[PDB]
Amino acid sequence: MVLHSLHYLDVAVSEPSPGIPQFVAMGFVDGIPFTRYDSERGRMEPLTEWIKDSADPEYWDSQTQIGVGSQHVYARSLETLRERYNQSGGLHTVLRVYGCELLSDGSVRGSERFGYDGRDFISFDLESGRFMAADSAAEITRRRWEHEGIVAERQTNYLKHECPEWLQKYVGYGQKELERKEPPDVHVSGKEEHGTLILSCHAYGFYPKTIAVNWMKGDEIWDQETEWGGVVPNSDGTFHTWARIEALPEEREQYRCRVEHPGMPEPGIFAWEP
Amino acid sequence: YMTLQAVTF
Amino acid sequence: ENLYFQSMAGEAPKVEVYARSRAEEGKENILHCFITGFHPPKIDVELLKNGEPMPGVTYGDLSFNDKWQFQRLVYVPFIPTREDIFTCRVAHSTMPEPRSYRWEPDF
Ligand SMILES: [Cl-]
Ligand SMILES: [Mg+2]
Numbered sequence: 001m002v003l004h005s006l007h008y009l010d011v012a013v014s015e016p017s018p019g020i021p022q023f024v025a026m027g028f029v030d031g032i033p034f035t036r037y038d039s040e041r042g043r044m045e046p047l048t049e050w051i052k053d054s055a056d057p058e059y060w061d062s063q064t065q066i067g068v069g070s071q072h073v074y075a076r077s078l079e080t081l082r083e084r085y086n087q088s089g090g091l092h093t094v095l096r097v098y099g100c101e102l103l104s105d106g107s108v109r110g111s112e113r114f115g116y117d118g119r120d121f122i123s124f125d126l127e128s129g130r131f132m133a134a135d136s137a138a139e140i141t142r143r144r145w146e147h148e149g150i151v152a153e154r155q156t157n158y159l160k161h162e163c164p165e166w167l168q169k170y171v172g173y174g175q176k177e178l179e180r181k182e183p184p185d186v187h188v189s190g191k192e193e194h195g196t197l198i199l200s201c202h203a204y205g206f207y208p209k210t211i212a213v214n215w216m217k218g219d220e221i222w223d224q225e226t227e228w229g230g231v232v233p234n235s236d237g238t239f240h241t242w243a244r245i246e247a248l249p250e251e252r253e254q255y256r257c258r259v260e261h262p263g264m265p266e267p268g269i270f271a272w273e274p
Numbered sequence: 275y276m277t278l279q280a281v282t283f
Numbered sequence: 284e285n286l287y288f289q290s291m292a293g294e295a296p297k298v299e300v301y302a303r304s305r306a307e308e309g310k311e312n313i314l315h316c317f318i319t320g321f322h323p324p325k326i327d328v329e330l331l332k333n334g335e336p337m338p339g340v341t342y343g344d345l346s347f348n349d350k351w352q353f354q355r356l357v358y359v360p361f362i363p364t365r366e367d368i369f370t371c372r373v374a375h376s377t378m379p380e381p382r383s384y385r386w387e388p389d390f
Contacts, residue, residue, distance in 0.1 A: 008276055008278075009346055009347065010280065011324075011345055011347070013324070017325050019342055019345070020324055020325070020345060024344070024345065025276060026344060026346070027276055033344065035276065036344075037276065044276065059275075062277065063275070063276045063277065066276055066277050066278075066279045067276065069279045069280075070279050070280040073279060073280040073281065073282045074280055076282045077280065077282050077283045080282065080283045081283060084283075085286075085288035086286060086287045086288060087287075087288050087289075087290065088289075088290065091323055091325070092290075093323065093324065095347055095351055096280060097347075098278060112278070115347075115351035117290055117291055117322075117323075118291060118294070118322040118323075118350075118351045118352070119291070119351065120351075121283075122283075140283075141283045145281065151281055154278075154281075155278070158277070158278040159278075162275060162277065163275075166275035185304065185305060187305040187389060189387070189388075189389045189390070191387065200387070200389070202301070202305070202389055204302070204303065204304050204305060205303060205304060229299060229301075230299065230317075230319070232299050232301065232315070232317045232356075233315075233317065233343075233356055234303050234313070234315065235303070235313055235315065235341065235343075235356065235358045236303065236313075238303075240301045240303075240315070242301075
């Protein structure tokens with residue numbers, strides 16, 4: 001089971017537009033954003049108090065250099081693929097997710113995945129240990145990267161050794177924030193329109209992201225008729241979600257919502273209270 | 275620790 | 284080969300509209316618009332109270348999912364009322380017209 005995760009999302013665009021710099025690299029610990037580089041500011045900077053108070057100057061400085069290097073590599077990568085796919089100019093995007101997970105058995109998973117204009121380009125995983133090309137333009141990259149095993153050795157040492165060592169440092173630094181449990185505030189709402197009552201069970205303000213939200217109809221579970229929203233983010237670092245159902249107005253009182261969360265003394269039960 | 279620079283395609 | 288590749292079909296955004304907390308009249312709250320599923324990453328977003336732009340709009344960081352689809356959280360302080368219509372209006376390349384998503388009040 002995954003216990004902790006360190007990952008970075010890189011977004012590089014060929015054409016800056018409002019609210020999209022040329023390059024942004026963001027770091028997450030257990031999903032929580034904690035560090036950021038962008039081509040406007042030109043510096044790695046802390047997004048949490050805990051990494052600010054635990055980091056030193058050389059931490060920010062050393063990562064600035066890689067962010068600057070990555071920015072320039074992506075500019076070159078964007079021109080390479082445009083020329084390779086003989087594409088139109090204008091807006092193109094290279095995305096990269098990479099990082100590691102620490103499992104309950106003490107073991108490490110890691111990977112690096114790149115995307116181009118919304119599809120798989122090339123990917124790497126510690127399980128298989130070789131670059132996978134999604135199409136024939138990526139095959140050219142795969143061949144160059146596999147030469148003398150050089151890039152696969154750097155990726156492996158980073159994802160298998162450096163990444164989990166730094167994850168363990170950050171888990172310490174962030175222990176308080178990471179460990180906390182705020183339970184949901186649950187409410188059921190009811191729009192009784194078109195002859196057809198719609199019933200929504202909303203869980204507000206919960207951390208972490210794991211939650212069970214299930215509609216009941218008498219003694220039955222009602223998934224067949226249930227629709228769930230995503231588990232989506234609040235501005236304050238907590239989560240929101242909802243399970244919905246359609247009911248006849250007459251039978252509205254047969255239905256109740258069950259919600260379990262780690263911050264819960266016990267599983268809770270909720271109904272429409274007009 | 276963001277020290278895995280992108281490699282050019 | 285002599286091949287000329289076309290960018291590929293855009294994906295139109297999906298929009299979830301939700302408050303931080305259950306609406307209570309006169310109690311300050313946060314209206315969220317979570318925009319997902321879209322390619323390419325350019326969107327225009329407005330948060331409207333009776334068709335008028337709500338003051339203090341904040342937009343979060345651009346991220347993306349396993350399918351490389353972009354997502355963004357846009358949010359603003361508000362006081363929910365029964366009389367007023369709160370909408371998230373979203374424009375994208377793939378969309379011939381901008382589209383409004385109404386906050387269904389959770390009073
Ligand atoms: Cl990952
Ligand atoms: Mg895609």
